[PDB]
Short mmCIF file of C-alpha atoms and ligand atoms in Angstrom, two decimals:
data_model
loop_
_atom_site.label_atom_id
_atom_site.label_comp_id
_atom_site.label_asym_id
_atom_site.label_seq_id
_atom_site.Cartn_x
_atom_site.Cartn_y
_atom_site.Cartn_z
CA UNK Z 4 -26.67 -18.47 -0.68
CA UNK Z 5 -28.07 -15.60 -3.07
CA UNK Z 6 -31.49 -15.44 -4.74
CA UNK Z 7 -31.55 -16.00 -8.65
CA UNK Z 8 -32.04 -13.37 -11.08
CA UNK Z 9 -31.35 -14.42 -14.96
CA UNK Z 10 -29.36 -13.94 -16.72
CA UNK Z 11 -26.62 -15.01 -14.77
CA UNK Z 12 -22.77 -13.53 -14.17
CA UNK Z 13 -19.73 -15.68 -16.03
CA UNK S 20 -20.97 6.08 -31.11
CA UNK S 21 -17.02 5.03 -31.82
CA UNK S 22 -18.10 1.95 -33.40
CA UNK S 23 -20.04 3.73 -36.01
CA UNK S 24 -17.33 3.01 -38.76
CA UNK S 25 -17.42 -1.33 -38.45
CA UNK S 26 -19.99 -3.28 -39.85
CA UNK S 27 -22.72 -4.84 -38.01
CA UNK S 28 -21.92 -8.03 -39.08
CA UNK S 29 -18.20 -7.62 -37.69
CA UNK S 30 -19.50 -5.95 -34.60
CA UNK S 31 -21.86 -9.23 -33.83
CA UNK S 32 -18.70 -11.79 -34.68
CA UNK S 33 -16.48 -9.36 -31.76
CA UNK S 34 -19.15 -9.60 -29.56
CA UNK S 35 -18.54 -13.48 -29.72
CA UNK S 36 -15.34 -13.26 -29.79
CA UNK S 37 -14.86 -10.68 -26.47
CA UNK S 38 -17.65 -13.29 -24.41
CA UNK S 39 -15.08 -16.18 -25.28
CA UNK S 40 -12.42 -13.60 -24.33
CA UNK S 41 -14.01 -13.02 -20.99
CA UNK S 42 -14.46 -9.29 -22.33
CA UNK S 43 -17.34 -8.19 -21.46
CA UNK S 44 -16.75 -4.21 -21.34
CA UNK S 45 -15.68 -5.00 -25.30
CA UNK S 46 -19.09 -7.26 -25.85
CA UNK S 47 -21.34 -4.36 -24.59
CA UNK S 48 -19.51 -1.91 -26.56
CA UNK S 49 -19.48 -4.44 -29.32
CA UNK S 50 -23.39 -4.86 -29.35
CA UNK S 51 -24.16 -1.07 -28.62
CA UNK S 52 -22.37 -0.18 -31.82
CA UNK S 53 -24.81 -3.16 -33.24
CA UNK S 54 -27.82 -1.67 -31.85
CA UNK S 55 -27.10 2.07 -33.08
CA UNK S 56 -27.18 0.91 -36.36
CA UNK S 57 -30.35 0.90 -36.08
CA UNK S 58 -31.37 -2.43 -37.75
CA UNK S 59 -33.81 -4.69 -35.24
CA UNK S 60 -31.82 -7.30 -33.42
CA UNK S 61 -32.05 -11.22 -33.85
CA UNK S 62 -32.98 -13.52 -31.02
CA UNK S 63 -28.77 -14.63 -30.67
CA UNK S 64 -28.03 -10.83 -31.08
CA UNK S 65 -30.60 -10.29 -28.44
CA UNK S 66 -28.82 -12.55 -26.05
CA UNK S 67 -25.65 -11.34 -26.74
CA UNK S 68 -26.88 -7.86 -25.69
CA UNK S 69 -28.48 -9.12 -22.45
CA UNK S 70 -25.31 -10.99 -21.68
CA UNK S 71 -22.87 -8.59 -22.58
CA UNK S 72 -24.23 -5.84 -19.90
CA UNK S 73 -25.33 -8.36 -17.46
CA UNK S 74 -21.71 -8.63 -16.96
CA UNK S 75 -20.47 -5.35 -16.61
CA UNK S 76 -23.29 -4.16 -14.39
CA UNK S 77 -22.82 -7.14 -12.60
CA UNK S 78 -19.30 -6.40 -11.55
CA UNK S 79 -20.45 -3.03 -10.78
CA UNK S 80 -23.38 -4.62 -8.20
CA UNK S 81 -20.95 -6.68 -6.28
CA UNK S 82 -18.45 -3.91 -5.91
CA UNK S 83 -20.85 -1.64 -4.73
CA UNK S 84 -22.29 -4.05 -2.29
CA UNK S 85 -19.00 -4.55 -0.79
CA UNK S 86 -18.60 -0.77 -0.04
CA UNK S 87 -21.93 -0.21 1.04
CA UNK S 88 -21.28 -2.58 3.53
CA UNK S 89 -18.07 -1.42 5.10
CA UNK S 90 -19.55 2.38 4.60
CA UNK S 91 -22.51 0.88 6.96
CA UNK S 92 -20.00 -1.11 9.23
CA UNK S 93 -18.48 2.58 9.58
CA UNK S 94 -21.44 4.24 10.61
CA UNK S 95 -22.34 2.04 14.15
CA UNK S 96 -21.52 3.33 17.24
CA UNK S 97 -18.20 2.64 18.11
CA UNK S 98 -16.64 2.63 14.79
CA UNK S 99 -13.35 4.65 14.16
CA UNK S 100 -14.07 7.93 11.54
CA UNK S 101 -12.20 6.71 8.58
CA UNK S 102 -12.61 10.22 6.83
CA UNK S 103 -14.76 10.39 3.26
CA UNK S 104 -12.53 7.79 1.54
CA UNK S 105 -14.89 5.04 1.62
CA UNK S 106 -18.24 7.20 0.88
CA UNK S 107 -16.42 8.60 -2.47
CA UNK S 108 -15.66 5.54 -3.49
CA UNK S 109 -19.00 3.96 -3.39
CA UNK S 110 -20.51 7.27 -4.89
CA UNK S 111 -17.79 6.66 -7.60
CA UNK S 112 -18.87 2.86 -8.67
CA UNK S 113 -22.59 3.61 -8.02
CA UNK S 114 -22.35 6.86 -10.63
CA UNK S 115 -20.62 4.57 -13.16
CA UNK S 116 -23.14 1.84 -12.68
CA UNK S 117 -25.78 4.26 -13.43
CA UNK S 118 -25.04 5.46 -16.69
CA UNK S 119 -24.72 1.81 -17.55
CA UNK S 120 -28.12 1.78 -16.64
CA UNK S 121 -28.70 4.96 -18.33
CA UNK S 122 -27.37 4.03 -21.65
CA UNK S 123 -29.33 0.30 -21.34
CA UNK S 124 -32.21 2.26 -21.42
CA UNK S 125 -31.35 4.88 -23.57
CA UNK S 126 -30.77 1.56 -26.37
CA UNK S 127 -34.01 0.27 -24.99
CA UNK S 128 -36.12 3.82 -25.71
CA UNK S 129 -34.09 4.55 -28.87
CA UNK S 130 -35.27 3.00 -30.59
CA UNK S 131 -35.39 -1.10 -29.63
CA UNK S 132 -39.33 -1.49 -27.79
CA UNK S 133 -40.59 1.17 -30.40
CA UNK S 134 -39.83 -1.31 -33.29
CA UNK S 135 -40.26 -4.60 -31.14
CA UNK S 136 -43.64 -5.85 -32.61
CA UNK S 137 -43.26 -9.56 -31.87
CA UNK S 138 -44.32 -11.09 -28.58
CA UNK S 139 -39.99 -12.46 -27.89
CA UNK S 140 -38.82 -9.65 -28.84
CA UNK S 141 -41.25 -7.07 -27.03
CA UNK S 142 -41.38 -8.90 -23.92
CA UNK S 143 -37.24 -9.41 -24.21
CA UNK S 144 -37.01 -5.80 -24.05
CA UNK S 145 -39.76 -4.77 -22.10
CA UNK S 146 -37.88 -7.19 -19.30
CA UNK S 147 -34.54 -5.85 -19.91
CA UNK S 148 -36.07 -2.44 -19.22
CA UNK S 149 -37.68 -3.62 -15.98
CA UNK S 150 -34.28 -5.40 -14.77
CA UNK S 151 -32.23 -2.09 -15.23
CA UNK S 152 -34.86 0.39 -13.71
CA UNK S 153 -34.33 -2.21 -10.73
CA UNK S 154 -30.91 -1.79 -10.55
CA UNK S 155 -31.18 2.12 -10.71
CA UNK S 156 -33.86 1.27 -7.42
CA UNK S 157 -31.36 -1.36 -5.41
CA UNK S 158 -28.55 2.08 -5.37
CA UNK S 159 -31.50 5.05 -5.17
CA UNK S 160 -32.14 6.57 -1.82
CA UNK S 161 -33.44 10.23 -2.87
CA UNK S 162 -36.72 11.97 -4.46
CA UNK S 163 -37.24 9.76 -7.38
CA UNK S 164 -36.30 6.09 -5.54
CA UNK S 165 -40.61 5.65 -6.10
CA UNK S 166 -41.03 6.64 -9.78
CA UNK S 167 -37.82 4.40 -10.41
CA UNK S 168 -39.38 1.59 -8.64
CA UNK S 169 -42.55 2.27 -10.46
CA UNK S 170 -41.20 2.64 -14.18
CA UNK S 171 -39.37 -1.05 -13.21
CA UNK S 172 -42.92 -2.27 -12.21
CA UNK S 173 -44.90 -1.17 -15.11
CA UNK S 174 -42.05 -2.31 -17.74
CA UNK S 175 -42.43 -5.74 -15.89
CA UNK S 176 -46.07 -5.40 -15.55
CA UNK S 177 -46.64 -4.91 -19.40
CA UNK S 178 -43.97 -8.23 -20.50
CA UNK S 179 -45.94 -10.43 -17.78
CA UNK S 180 -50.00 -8.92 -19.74
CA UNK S 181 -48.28 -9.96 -23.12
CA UNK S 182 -46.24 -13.16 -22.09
CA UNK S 183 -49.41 -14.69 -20.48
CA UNK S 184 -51.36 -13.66 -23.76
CA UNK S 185 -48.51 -14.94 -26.57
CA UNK S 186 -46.06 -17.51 -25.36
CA UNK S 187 -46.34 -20.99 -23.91
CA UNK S 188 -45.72 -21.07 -19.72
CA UNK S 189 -42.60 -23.06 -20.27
CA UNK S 190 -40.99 -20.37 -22.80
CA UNK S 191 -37.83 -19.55 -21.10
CA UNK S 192 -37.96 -15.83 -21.55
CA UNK S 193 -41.44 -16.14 -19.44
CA UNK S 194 -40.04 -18.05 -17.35
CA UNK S 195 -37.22 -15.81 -16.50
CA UNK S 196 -39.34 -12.71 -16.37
CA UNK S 197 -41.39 -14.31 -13.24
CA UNK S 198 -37.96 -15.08 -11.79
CA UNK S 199 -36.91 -11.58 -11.93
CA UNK S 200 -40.29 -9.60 -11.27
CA UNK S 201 -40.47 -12.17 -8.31
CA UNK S 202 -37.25 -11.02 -7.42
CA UNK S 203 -38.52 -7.24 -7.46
CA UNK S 204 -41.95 -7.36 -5.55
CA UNK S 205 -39.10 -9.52 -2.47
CA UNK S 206 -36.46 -7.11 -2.25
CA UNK S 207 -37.45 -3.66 -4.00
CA UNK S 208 -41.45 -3.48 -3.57
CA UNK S 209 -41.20 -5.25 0.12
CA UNK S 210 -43.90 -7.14 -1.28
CA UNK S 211 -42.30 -11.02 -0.17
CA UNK S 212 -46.20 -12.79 -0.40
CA UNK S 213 -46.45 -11.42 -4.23
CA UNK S 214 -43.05 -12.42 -4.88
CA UNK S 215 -43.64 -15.71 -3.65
CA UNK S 216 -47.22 -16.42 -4.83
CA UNK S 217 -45.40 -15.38 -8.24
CA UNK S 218 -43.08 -17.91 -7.89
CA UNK S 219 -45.41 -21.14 -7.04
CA UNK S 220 -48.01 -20.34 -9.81
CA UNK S 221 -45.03 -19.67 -12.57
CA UNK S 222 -43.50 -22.82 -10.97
CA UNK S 223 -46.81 -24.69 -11.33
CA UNK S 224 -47.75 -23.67 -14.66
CA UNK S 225 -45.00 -24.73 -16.50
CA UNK S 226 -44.86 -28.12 -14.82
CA UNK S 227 -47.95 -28.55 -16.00
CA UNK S 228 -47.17 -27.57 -19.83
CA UNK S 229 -43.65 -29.36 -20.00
CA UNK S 230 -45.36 -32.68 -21.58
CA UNK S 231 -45.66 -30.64 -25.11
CA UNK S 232 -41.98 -30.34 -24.99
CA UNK S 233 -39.43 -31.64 -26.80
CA UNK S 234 -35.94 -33.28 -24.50
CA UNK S 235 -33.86 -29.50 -25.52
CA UNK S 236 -37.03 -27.33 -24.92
CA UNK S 237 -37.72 -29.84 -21.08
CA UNK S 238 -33.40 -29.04 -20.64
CA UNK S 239 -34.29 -25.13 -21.12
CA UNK S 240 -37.39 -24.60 -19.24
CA UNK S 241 -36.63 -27.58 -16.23
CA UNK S 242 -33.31 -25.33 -15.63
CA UNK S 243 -35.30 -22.33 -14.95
CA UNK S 244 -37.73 -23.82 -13.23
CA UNK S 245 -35.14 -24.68 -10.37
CA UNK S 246 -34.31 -21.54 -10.13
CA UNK S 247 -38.04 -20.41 -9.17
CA UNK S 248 -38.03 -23.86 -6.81
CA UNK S 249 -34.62 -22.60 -5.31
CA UNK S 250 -35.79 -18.93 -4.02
CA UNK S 251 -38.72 -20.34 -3.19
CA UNK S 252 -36.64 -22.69 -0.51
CA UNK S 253 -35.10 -19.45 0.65
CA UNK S 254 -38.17 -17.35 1.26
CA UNK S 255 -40.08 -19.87 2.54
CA UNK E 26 -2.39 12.33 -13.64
CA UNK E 27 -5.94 12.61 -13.00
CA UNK E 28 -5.36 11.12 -9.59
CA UNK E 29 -3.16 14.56 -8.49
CA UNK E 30 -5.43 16.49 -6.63
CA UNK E 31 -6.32 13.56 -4.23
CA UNK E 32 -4.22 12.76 -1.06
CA UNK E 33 -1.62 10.16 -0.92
CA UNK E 34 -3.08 8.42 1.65
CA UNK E 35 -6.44 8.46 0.49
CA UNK E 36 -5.29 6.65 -2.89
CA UNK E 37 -3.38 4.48 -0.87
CA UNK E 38 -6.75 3.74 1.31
CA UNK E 39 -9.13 3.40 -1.94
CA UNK E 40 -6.61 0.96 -3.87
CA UNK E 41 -7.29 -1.08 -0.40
CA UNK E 42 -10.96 -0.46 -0.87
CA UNK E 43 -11.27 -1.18 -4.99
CA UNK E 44 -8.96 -4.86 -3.70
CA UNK E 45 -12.43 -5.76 -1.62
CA UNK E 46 -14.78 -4.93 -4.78
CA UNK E 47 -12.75 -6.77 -6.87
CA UNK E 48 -12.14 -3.79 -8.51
CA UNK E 49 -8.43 -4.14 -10.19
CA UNK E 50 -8.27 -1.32 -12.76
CA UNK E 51 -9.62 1.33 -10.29
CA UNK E 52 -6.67 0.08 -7.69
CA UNK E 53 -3.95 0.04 -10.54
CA UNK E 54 -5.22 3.69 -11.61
CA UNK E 55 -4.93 4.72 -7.44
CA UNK E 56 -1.82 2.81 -6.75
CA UNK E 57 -0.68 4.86 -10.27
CA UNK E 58 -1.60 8.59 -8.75
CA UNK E 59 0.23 6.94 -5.02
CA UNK E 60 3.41 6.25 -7.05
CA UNK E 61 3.13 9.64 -8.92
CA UNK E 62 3.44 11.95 -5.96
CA UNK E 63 7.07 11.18 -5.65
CA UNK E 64 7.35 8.90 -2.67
CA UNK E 65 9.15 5.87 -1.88
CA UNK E 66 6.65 3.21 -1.29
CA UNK E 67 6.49 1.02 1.60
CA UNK E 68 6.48 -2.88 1.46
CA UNK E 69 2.57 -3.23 2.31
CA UNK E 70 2.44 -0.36 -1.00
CA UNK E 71 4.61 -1.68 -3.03
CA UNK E 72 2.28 -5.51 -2.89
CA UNK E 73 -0.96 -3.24 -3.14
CA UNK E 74 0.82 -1.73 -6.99
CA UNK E 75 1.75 -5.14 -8.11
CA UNK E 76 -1.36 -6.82 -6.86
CA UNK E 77 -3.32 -4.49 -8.57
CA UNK E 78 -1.40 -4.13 -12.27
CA UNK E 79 -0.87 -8.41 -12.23
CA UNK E 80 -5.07 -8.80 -12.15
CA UNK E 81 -5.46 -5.72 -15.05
CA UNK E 82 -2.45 -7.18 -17.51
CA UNK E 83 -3.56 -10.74 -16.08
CA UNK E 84 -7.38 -10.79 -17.41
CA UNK E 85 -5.74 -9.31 -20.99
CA UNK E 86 -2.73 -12.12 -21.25
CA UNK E 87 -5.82 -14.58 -20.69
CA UNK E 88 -8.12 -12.87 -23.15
CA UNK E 89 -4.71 -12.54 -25.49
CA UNK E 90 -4.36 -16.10 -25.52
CA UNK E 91 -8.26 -16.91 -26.08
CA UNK E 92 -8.13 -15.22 -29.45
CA UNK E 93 -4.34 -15.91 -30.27
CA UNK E 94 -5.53 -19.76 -30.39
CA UNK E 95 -9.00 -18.79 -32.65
CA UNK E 96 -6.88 -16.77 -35.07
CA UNK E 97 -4.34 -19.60 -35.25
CA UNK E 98 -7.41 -22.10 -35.93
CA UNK E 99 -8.55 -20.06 -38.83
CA UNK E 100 -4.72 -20.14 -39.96
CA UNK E 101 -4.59 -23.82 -40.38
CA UNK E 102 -5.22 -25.82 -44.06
CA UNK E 103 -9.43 -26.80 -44.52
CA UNK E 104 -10.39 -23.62 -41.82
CA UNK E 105 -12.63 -20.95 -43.48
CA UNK E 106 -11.93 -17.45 -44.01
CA UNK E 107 -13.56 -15.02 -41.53
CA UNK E 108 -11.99 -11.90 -42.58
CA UNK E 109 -9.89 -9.94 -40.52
CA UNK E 110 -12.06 -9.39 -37.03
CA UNK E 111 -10.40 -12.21 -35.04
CA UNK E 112 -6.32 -10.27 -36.09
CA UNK E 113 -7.64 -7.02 -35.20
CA UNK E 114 -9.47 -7.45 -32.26
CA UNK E 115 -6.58 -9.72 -31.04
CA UNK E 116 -4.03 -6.56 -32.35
CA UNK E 117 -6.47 -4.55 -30.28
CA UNK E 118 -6.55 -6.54 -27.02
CA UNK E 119 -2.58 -6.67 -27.43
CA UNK E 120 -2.26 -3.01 -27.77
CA UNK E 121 -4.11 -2.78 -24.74
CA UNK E 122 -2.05 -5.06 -22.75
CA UNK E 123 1.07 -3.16 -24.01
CA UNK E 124 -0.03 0.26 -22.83
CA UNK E 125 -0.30 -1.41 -19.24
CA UNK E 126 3.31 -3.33 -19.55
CA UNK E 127 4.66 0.64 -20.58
CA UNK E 128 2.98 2.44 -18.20
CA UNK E 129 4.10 0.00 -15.28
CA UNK E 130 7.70 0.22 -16.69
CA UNK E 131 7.25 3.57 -16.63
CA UNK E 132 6.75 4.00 -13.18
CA UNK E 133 9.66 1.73 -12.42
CA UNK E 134 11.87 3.67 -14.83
CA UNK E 135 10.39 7.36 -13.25
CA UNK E 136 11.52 6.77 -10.63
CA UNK E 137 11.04 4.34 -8.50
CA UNK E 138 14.05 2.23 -8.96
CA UNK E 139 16.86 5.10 -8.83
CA UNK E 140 15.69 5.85 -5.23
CA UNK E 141 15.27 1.93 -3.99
CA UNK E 142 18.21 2.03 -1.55
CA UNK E 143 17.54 -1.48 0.49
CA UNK E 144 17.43 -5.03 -1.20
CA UNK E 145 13.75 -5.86 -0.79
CA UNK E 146 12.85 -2.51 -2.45
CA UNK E 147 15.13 -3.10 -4.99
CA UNK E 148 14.50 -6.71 -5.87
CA UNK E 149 11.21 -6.04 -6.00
CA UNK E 150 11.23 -3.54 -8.46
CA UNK E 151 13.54 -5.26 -10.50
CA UNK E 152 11.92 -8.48 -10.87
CA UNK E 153 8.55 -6.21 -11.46
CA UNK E 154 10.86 -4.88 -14.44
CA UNK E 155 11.61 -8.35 -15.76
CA UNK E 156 8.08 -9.39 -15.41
CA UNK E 157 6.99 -7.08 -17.59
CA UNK E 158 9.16 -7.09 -20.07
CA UNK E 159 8.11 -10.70 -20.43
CA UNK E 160 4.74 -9.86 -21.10
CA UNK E 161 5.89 -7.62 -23.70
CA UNK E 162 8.30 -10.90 -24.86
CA UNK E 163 4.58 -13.53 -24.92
CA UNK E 164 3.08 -11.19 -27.68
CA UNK E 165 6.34 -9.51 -29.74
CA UNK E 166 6.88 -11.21 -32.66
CA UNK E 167 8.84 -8.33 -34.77
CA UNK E 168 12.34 -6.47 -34.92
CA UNK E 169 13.31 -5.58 -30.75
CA UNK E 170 11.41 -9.23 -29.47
CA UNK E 171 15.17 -9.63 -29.00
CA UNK E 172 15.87 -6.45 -27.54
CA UNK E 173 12.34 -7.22 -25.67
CA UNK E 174 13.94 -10.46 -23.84
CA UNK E 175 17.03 -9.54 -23.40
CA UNK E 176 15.33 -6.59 -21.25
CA UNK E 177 13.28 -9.31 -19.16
CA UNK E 178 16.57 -11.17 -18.58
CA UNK E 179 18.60 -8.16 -18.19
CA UNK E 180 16.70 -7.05 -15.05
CA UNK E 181 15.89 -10.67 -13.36
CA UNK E 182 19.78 -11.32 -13.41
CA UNK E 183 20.21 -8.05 -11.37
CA UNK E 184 17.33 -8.67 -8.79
CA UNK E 185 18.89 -11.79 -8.94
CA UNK E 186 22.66 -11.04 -7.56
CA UNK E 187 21.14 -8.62 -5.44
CA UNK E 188 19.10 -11.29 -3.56
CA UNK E 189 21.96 -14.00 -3.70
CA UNK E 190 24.27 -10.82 -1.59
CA UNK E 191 21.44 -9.58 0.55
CA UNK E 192 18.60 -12.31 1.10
CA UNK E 193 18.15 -15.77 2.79
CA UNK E 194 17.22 -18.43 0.35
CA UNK E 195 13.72 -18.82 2.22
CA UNK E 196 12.49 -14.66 1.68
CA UNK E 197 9.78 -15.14 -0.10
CA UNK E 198 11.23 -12.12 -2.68
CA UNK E 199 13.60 -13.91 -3.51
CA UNK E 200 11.60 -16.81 -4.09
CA UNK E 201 8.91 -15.40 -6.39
CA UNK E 202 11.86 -13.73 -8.43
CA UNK E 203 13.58 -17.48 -8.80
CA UNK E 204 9.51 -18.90 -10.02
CA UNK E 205 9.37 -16.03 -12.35
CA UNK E 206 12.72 -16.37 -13.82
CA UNK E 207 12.96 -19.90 -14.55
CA UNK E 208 9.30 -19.33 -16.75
CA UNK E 209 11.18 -17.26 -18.48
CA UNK E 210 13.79 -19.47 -19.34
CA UNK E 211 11.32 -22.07 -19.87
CA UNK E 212 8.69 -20.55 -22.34
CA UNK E 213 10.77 -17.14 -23.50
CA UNK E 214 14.36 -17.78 -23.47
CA UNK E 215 13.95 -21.58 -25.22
CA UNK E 216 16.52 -22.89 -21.62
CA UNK E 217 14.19 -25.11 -20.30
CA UNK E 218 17.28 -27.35 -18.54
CA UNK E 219 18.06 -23.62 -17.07
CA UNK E 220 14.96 -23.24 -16.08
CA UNK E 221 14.58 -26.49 -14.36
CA UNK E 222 18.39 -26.30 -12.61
CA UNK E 223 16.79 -22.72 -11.36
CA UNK E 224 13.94 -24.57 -9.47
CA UNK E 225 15.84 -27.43 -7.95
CA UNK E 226 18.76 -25.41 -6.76
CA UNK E 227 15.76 -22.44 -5.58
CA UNK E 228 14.24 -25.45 -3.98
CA UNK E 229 17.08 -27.29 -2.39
CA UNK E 230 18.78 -23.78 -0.73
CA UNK E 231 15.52 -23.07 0.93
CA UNK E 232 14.13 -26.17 2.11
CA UNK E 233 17.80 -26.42 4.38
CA UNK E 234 16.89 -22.33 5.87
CA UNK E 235 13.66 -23.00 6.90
CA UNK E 236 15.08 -24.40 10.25
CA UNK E 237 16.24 -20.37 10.95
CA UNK E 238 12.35 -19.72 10.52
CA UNK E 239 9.29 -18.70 12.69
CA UNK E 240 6.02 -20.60 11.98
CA UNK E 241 4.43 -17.85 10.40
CA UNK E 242 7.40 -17.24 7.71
CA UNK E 243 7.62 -21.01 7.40
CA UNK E 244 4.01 -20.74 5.68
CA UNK E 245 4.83 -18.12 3.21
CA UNK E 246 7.97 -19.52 2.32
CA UNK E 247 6.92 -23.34 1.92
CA UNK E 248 3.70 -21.69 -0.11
CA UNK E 249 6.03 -20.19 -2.80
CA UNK E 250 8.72 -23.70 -2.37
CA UNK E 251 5.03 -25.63 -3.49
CA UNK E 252 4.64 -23.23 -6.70
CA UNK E 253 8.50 -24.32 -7.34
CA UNK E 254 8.10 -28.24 -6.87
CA UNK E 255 4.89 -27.80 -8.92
CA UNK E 256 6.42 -26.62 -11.83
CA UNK E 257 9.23 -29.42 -11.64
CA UNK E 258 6.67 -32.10 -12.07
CA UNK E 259 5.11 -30.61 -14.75
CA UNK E 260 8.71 -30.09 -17.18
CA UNK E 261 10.15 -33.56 -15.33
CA UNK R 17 -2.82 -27.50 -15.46
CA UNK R 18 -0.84 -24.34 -15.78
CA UNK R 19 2.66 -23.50 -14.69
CA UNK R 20 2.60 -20.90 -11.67
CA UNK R 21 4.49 -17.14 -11.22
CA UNK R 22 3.86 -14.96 -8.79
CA UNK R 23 1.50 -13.15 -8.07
CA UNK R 24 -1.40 -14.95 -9.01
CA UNK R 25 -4.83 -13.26 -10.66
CA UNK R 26 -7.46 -13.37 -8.08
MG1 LIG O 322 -15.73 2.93 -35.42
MG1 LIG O 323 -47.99 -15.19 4.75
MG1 LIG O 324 -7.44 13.99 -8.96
MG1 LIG O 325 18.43 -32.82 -20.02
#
């Protein structure tokens, strides 16, 4: 499970 | 530029196009072409720009992870010498990842935050400059790694002064500035007690302004706002 | 090529690598420079070259058929005009796409199937050949699309006797070749009944080998027999 | 649901 960063990857 | 012959207004509608496409190498050529005409950008074209190399850098992240991994897995003791192959290759993606980089910010400096006198569009920028500084610093490993982690910082630093001054704590691009800064001070600045006090007064803030909103506007910022409450989980 | 000056088995090893990082156009261009030196290619090589050209022409047939569909929307009576970008970026994606289908038929043609002696070299290459001549076949629309198909067909019927001769109905070859070529009846040739008498009798032939088999080619033949039944109930 | 050849896009 990775951390969020925006935006995000299709 | 090679796109310096189409129109803007062509260039913006094959942006769209290449993101329904899955494109994305098209959509950031698309919207550099847009930007080096050297008209401001809109808040869509804006997104479009962010979106467009999120995606190729993105791909470029993840591939380079993978290699830097099985380089490392072939550096223990008791690993087999697989000759240079592997070390090239990640060399290779991480050279082409940072001229990506390199030309983000070379859009950002020429001339985008010069012009950029609104608090969206400033802080936009300013936060696009900090996220792509960062991904120079997740790859770096020489003389420069700490003025590369610092230029990130003070790009961040400077959005998160005018944010707090000019936009609402619920307004999305706020919102995902904290995520991301957050994000830096955890895994770049080993900072993980700024990154998470970050992320419970950002958190806090906005749940605390979302009664202003409007049900779209609550959809927007509520979305975000998981994503804070989600690394927060992890770290803690 | 530019890939000359590196080692065979270095290309061979970074193809392997660019696979992990999802990295298709990097292993296409190193499986490219592999092929180039002269050598026959082994069966482990010869997956690693279609593997990798199948995900490059695969993301451009999708993207192909994304703006195929838009340009055909703004073709229809009460849709507005929105000039020309949709044709020419969908002329430019398709142009695209076509280098790749040349340059992989190029390789095939120079000259990798002269020197493929055996039948699963052979076959192989063949149904490769007839593969991508029906890529060409999903875009033509001009003066060879019959030249074009009759290329595609040309080259499965081959691959085709060979495999009848020289294969069991279960090798899983054979069995991809039979999938492929009954598409091609179905959605390039306008055979549909063909291509449906191709998958039962594919089907049937197999299911009454698989006694002869060990448990491990059992899987990879009843994986490819599932693609085959799949495609029955969808035209039945 | 789309009709399958071989090989398949990862
Ligand atoms: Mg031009
Ligand atoms: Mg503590
Ligand atoms: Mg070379
Ligand atoms: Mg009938």
């Amino acid at each position: 499970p990775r951390r969020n960063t925006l935006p995000a990857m299709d | 530029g090679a796109m310096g012959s189409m129109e803007r207004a062509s260039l913006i509608q094959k942006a769209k196009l290449a993101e329904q496409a899955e494109r994305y190498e098209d959509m950031a050529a698309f919207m550099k072409g847009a930007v080096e005409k050297g008209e401001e950008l809109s808040c869509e074209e804006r997104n479009l720009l962010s979106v467009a190399y999120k995606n190729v850098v993105g791909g470029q992240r993840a591939a380079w992870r993978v290699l830097s991994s099985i380089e490392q897995k072939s550096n223990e003791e008791g690993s087999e010498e697989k000759g240079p192959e592997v070390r090239e290759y990640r060399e290779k993606v991480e050279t082409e990842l940072q001229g990506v980089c390199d030309t983000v910010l070379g859009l950002l400096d020429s001339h985008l935050i010069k012009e950029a006198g609104d608090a969206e569009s400033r802080v936009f920028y300013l936060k696009m400059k900090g996220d792509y500084y960062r991904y120079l610093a997740e790859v770096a490993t020489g003389d420069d790694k700490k003025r590369i982690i610092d230029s990130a910082r003070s790009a961040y630093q400077e959005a998160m002064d005018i944010s707090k001054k000019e936009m609402p704590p619920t307004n999305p691009i706020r919102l995902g500035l904290a995520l991301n800064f957050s994000v830096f001070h955890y895994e770049i600045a080993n900072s993980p007690e700024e990154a998470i006090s970050l992320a419970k007064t950002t958190f806090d803030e906005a749940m605390a302004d979302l009664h202003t909103l409007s049900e779209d506007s609550y959809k927007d910022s509520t979305l975000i706002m998981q994503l804070l409450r989600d690394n927060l989980t992890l770290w803690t």
